[PDB]
C-alpha cells in the first residue's frame, strides 16, 4: 500500500487521468470550432451577387475570428504536450475550420488558400501557435469541394452564368491534384476521392447544360 509499486501506479493514475481530462476539454473545444465553422459555411452560402456579398463577408470574417479564438485556447492547452497524442481530439474541428476559411477565401479571391496562409492567421501573441497538418488540410479541402458545387448549383438557380464555370475550373484543378496524389496519401484522404468525383460531375454537368442552353437560337415563339 505504501510500496514502490502502488506509489508508481498512483503517479500513473494521476498522469493518465490528467491526459484524459485535457483530452475531453479539447474534444469540447473542437466541437465548438466545428459547429461554428459549419454555421460560417451556411452563412457564406447565403450569398448572391446582390448587395449583401460585402457585409456577409465581413460578418463571416467576424465568426471566423471567434473560431480562431477557440483555436487559440486549443494551442494553449496543447503546448507542453506531444501533439500527436491529442491530435485525434481536435482533427475534425481543424478540418472544419480549413473548409470554412478556404471557402470564404475562394469567394473573395477565387483561388485556393495555401496551408502556410492558413497557419499564418493561426499565430497568437500576448505567443502561442498552431499548425494544421497536411492531412487536415487535404481533408478540409476535399470537404470544401462539396460546398463549391453547392454554390455552383445555387448560382445557376438564380441566373448567374459566370460563377458556374469558375467553380467548374477550380474544382477541376483540385481534382487533378487529388489524382496527382493518389495512393501516396492515407486511406483517409482516398475515401474522399469518390465524393470528389461526384461533386465534379455535378458541376461539369451544370456547365454543360448552361453552354448547351445559352447557345440555342430559338426560331419558335410562344
Amino acid at each position: 500500500s505504501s510500496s514502490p509499486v502502488m506509489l508508481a501506479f498512483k503517479s500513473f493514475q494521476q498522469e493518465l487521468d490528467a491526459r484524459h481530462d485535457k483530452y475531453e476539454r479539447l474534444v469540447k473545444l473542437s466541437r465548438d470550432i466545428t459547429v461554428e465553422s459549419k454555421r460560417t459555411i451556411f452563412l457564406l452560402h447565403r450569398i448572391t451577387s446582390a448587395p449583401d456579398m460585402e457585409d456577409i463577408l465581413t460578418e463571416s470574417e467576424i465568426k471566423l475570428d471567434g473560431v480562431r479564438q477557440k483555436i487559440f485556447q486549443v494551442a494553449q492547452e496543447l503546448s507542453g504536450e506531444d501533439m500527436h497524442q491529442f491530435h485525434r481530439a481536435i482533427t475534425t474541428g481543424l478540418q472544419e475550420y480549413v473548409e470554412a476559411v478556404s471557402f470564404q477565401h475562394f469567394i473573395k479571391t477565387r483561388s485556393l488558400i495555401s496551408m502556410d496562409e492558413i497557419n499564418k492567421q493561426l499565430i497568437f501573441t500576448t505567443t502561442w501557435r498552431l499548425r494544421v497538418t497536411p492531412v487536415d488540410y487535404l481533408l478540409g479541402v476535399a470537404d470544401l469541394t462539396g460546398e463549391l458545387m453547392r454554390m455552383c448549383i445555387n448560382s445557376v438557380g438564380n441566373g448567374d452564368i459566370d460563377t458556374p464555370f469558375e467553380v467548374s475550373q477550380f474544382l477541376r484543378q483540385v481534382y487533378d491534384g487529388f489524382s496527382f496524389i493518389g495512393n501516396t496519401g492515407p486511406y483517409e484522404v482516398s475515401k474522399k476521392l469518390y465524393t470528389l468525383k461526384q461533386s465534379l460531375a455535378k458541376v461539369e454537368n451544370a456547365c454543360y447544360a448552361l453552354k448547351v442552353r445559352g447557345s440555342e437560337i430559338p426560331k419558335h415563339m410562344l
Binding site: 459549419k38 454555421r39 451556411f42 452560402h45 447565403r46 453547392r150 448549383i153 445555387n154 445557376v156 438557380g157 438564380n158 441566373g159 451544370a206 447544360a209 442552353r213 440555342e216 430559338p218 419558335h220 415563339m221 410562344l222
Partner: protein, 208 residues
Amino acid sequence: SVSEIFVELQGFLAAEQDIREEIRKVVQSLEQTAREILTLLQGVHQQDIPKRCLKAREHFGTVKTHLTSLKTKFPAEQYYRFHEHWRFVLQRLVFLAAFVVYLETETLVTREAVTEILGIEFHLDVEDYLSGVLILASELSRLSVNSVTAGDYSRPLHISTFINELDSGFRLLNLKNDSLRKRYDGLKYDVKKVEEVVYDLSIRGFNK
C-alpha cells in the same frame, strides 16, 4: 427482486408494442387518404383549380378525425421514438395542405394553418413542416414543367418567384446532418429546373 423487475419491464415493453400497433393502423389509413388526395390534385398535370381543391379539402376531414382518434389511443406524455414512419405520413400531409393552399392562393401555408387543417394544437414538429414544404417545392418544379407542356406559360412564372423566395428562406437555416439537410439539398435542383423553364420561355418571347 429480479424476476418481479423483469416481468414489470416485460409489461412496459408489451404496452409500448401495442401502442406501436395502433399507430400502425392509423398510419395505414392516413397513407390511404394521402394517396387519394394527391390523385385529386394532379390533376393540374393532366383544369379547374377551385373544384379539385374543394374535393381535396373534403377528404381532409377523414384526416382530421383520424388524428383526433389518436390523441387517446396514445398518451402524448413522451412521445415515443419509433414514429419516423409516423413523421413520414405527417410530412406527406403537410405537403398536401401546402399544395392546396398554393393552388388556391399561391402562397406558403403557415404552420398554424397546417395544424388548423389537420387538427393539431399533440404538436407538429418544425422539421416535419419544413420537409412537407420541400416536397411541395419538388411538386411545383415538376408542375412548372408540365404547365408549359399544357400551354399554361403563365404559371411557371409564379412558381418561379415563389420557389425562389423559398430558396432564400431555407438559406437562412443552419442545419444539422439529418433528414432535413438531406431533403434541403434537393431544393437547389428544383430551383435550377424552374429557372431553366423561365429561361426557355423568356428567349421565346414570354418575357412577362
